[PDB]
Amino acid sequence: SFAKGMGVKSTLVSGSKVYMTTFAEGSDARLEKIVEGDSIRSVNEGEAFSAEMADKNAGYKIGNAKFSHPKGYAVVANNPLYTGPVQQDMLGLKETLEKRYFGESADGNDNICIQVIHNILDIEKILAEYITNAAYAVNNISGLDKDIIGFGKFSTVYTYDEFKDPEHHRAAFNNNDKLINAIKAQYDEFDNFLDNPRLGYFGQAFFSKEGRNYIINYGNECYDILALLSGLAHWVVASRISRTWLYNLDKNLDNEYISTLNYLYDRITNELTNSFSKNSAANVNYIAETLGINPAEFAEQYFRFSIMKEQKNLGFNITKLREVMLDRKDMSEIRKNHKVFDSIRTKVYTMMDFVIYRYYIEEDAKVAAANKSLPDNEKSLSEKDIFVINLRGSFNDDQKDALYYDEANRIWRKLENIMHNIKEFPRILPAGRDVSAFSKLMYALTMFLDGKEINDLLTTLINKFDNIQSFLKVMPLIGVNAKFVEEYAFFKDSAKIADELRLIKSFARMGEPIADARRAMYIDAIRILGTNLSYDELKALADTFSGMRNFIINNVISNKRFHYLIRYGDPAHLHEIAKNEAVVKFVLGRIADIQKKQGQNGKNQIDRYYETCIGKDKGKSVSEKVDALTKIITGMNYDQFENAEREKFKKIISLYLTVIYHILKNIVNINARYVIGFHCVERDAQLYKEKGYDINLKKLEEKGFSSVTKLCAGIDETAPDKRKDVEKEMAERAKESIDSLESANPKLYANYIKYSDEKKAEEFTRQINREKAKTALNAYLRNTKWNVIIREDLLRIDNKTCTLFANKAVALEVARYVHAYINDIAEVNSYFQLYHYIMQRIIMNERYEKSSGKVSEYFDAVNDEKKYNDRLLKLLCVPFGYCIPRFKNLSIEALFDRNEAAKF
RNA sequence: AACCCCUACCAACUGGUCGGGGUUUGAAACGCCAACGAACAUCAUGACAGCGCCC
RNA sequence: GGCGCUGUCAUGAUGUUCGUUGGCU
Ligand SMILES: [Mg+2]
Secondary structure (H helix, E strand, O other): OHHHHHHOOOEEEEOOOOEEEOOOOOOOOEEEEEEEEEEEEOOOOOOOOOHHHHHOOOOEEEEEEOOOOOOOOEEEOOOOOOOOOOOOOOOHHHHHHHHHHOOOOOOOOOOHHHHHHHHHHHHHHHHHHHHHHHHHHHOOOOOOOOOOOOOOOOOOOHHHHHHOOOOOOOOHHHOOHHHHOOOOOOOHHHHHHHHHHHHHHOOOOOOEOOOOOOOEEHHHHHHHHHHHHHHHHHOOOOOOOOOOOOOOOOOOOOOHHHHHEEEEEEHHHHHHHHHHHHHHHHHHHHHHHOOOOOOHHHHHHHHHHHHHOOOOOOOOOHHHHHHHHHHHOOOHHHHOOOOOOHHHHHHHHHHHHHHHHHHHHHHHHHOOOOHOOOOOOOOOOOOHHHHHHHHHHOOOHHHHHHHHHHHHHHHHHHHHHHHHHHHOOOOOOOOOOOHHHHHHHHHHHHHHOHHHHHHHHHHHHHHHHHHHHHHHHHHHHOOOOOOOOOOOOOOHHHHHHHHHHHHHHOOOOOOOOOOOOOOOOOHHHHHHOOOOOOHHHHHHHOOOOOOOOOHHHHHHHOOHHHHHHHHHHHOOOOOOOOOOOOOOOHHHHHHHHHOOOOOOOOOOOHHHHHOOOOOOOOOOOOOHHHHHHHHHHOOEEEEEOOOHHHHHHHHOHHHHHHHHHHHHHHHHHHHHHHHHHHHHHHHHHHHHHHHHHOOOOOHHHOOOOHHHHHHHHOOOOOOOHHHHHHHHHHHHHHHHHHHHHOOOHHHHHHOOOOHHHHHHHHHHHHHHHHHHHHHOOOHHHOOHHHHHHHHHHHHOOHHHHHHHHHHHHOOOOOHHHOOOOOOOOOOOOOHHHHHHHHHHHHHHHHOOOOOOHHHHHHHHHHHHOOOHHHHHHHHHHHHHOOHHHHHOOOOOHHHHOOOOOOOO
């Protein structure tokens, strides 16, 4: 919107006043407006924007801002006091969440608390995707008999001394006989699993660095890490781990688990410092021997500038200055000589970047001091600002280089000696105990994930905490003095956690598999590419593994895209998901056509493999390239190993894994959204119970998870005991509403008389639905149309199907059983279709008794036309009916995906 | 685009024309130039081990 | 010592998606 970027950020309500906010430094906020009655009382000296009363006091005609409307129309901001008192949450749960989170402090006559609470609510839902992926990764690697790190596996409240030997530590168990034997079985399983060579795929969590080769830690650390991951799983989905576990960590966990988290944080931070101080000892030795300056301060800027982010808004590429600087004849041996400079390329480039940055900073500081001494009107812009202005004025690529060459030349004229010397040849991180356990556990969670997921998670968490801290800073100035209850007391120091997460981002990267677990990785690699050898002979080839063998080792074990799918390891399966030549077209077609749509200017992704597989010639068309590589993705059997034609299968390994990676990640992301939906329905059921409504929470599993939708839909019509009374009440209320219509809205009553006699019959039929809508409990299910749709849906639900849907969504069965039913789909046009076809097939496998009628017809449809049925999905999203946006986004193809909106 | 709110005329009001607002809706609060950090793939570059061919 | 390609890493160059800073109307 134009008003938001125009200079207006938020419009808050406290008491009878209105508190606008214009932007401030970073994500913070500054108060600029005070609206009361019909008055204008802008506070700041410099008016960021001007607003005045609009017509009928229904808004503010914002104007005289930085930039105006492109087509010349008034921009009006809604008055929050127009309707009446403070607007309510669409779910109608403002008071209960305010009381739960802020206790009795929150008065309730404000509009800032429930904006802070929703950020915590989004923190609760973001971690679902990443814990789902992390738990699936460990689940796949061993412990596949029944489950590992599940809802009943590990408790992180049992000390390892009390876990290994329950007999000697029976004091805390109150002398129980079943639990001790169950935990003995669990300890047997853990001891068997800890020695598994398959455990090497994960990095610093389990196999730690000692010297040239990784060494497994003691069982204490691994047991603690598994227990903590199981504790995260327990906290998210609900026992000593309630809904407030991660928020209260130090006082809840035993000293041993906190010791393990401190050990991991110390490991990573100390590794960074020791590396960049004495293991990259050449860099520090150059840092000390650079100029006549204090070594400690120089190192303090060097480390803070290199690894962290401080380049900020200086406005130009330093690296291209250094490129022009290297282009000269004096330092040509940097490129000409490859014997010695190759191992110090990064050091040299970083040092040149640092010295340029430091020169610019020092000049800026000196010029700023001079200008502060001088009058403000006459300002010396200095060289960095004149350079920025020159770059801004230019509008040609080559002309930019014409402007840009001179700066490098003159700085070389100034920086001769240090560059000649380079060419010729105070701990900062926050301890290991001051950091909260939340940050360490987030790091441990990221340590199981992929490169992109880490960045997404930490970026979103940082943004949410910045929002929280800015709102907390705004709270006192607007007259709200609500405080934090002891249970939810973690959110007071949101800024500190934000800083810790920023540092984690500065060192949160992938761990990468070990080099000691190669023996099992050969087995999994040969399994993925269609092996068919007998398992006795296959284990024989495994033990003898360490002809085409050498190819497997050298060109397979270390494949970059191999470490992206093995983390989702399904050895026995996963070769039948890219086996039918009707789903490879879709993923390749989509990526090549849309994602790499700018391959017209060079070698694309599919273009490279097409060129190397067709015979290094031919340029027919994109579609012919999509339908030619699929026949090479399909039938990637190991059993074959005219030889040149067979070599294509070796030639196209790196795309196979990419296809499987896309498919699996899309499936798990969709499943994670469905898990988010069910977590939301559970928490909303609990909240509606706490508010004081009529609900049965114990029998929520038995009923088809439709308790919340049934309650929020309004009056009850499923019970056949008093249908006559309900019908009579609705009829009399509709009749009363129709009779007293002129006083309600005279304009409609004026036209009502001219209607025909039968149109009155339709009007009464619709007024019955109108009254049933009036008898509801929610804002979403208050308009008649969605209420009648949901009411029609509710009458046709089968509870066992819903229960199976929920159980298989939570248990992640689809990502573990996809191989069974994927070859019986004729056409695929969206990931939605594939996921849901798998869903109805898994529901197929069980429900074959006592389902005569609608569900029977729908499953008949899946078996025959081999395409997922939209109506079955619409009946299976009934548990999601109290939030209409979510109900649509999880049942309509067009509205599911934000990226996919152009075609629909 | 979905979903809720708002001015002006129409309008069963379960619907529309010129438009605005929404961190308190769903994974979801901001017109260009000029830069920063993460991941994706291609060209060129020296070094590594290898799948096969010639002297 | 060469012909064809694949796979790791470090330097460099170009295009896409998310999120950040300063300037312009
Ligand atoms: Mg929100």
